[PDB]
Amino acid sequence: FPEVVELNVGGQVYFTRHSTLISIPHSLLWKMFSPLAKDSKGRFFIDRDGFLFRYILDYLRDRQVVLPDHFPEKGRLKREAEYFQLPDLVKLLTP
């Protein structure tokens, strides 16, 4: 795996460091990028909502997440956290 990974999430492209992807062991992204579907341009493909991945990705990097005011999609973000298997992130999203 390269040092900076080019991902395609539901058509949303993200560049990120490999260290961020494997930050939480036994998580979905850890299982994927620890020693895969690719698109036409060769980018590794994640079949999930591209917009919500920003905040999933921010948690892996900083182990915390600041949402905007009146964030209309917390329920959706929590669902994504479940898919990527991030128990603590689901916990933070528990009201």
Numbering used by the authors: 23 to 57, 65 to 124
From the paper:
The human KCTD family contains 25 soluble proteins that share a conserved potassium (K+) Channel Tetramerization Domain (a subtype of ‘BTB domain’) at their N-termini and have variable C-termini. The BTB fold of the Kv and KCTD families has a roughly pyramidal wedge shape and consists of five α-helices and a single β-sheet made from three β-strands. Here, we present novel X-ray crystal structures of the BTB domains of a further five members of the KCTD family and examine the stoichiometry and stability of their multimeric assemblies in solution. Overall, the pyramidal wedge shape of the KCTD family BTB domain creates a versatile scaffold compatible with a range of oligomeric assemblies and geometries that may impact function.
In contrast with the previous work, the expected closed pentameric structure is observed only in KCTD17, whereas the variant C-shaped pentamer, found in one crystal form of KCTD1, is also observed here in KCTD16. The angles between monomers in their assemblies vary from 90° for Kv4.3 to ∼65° for KCTD16, giving rise to observed oligomerization geometries that range from compact to splayed. Evolutionarily distant from these family members are KCTD16 and KCTD1, which belong to closely related clades F and A, respectively. Neither protein binds to Cul3 and both have now been observed to form unusual C-shaped pentamers by X-ray crystallography. We show here that this geometry is also maintained for the KCTD16 BTB in solution. Modest deviations at high q for KCTD16 may be attributed to flexibility and solvation effects not accounted for in the calculated scattering. Binding was observed for each of the BTB domains with the exception of KCTD16, which showed no evidence of Cul3 interaction. In contrast, KCTD16 again demonstrated no interaction with Cul3.
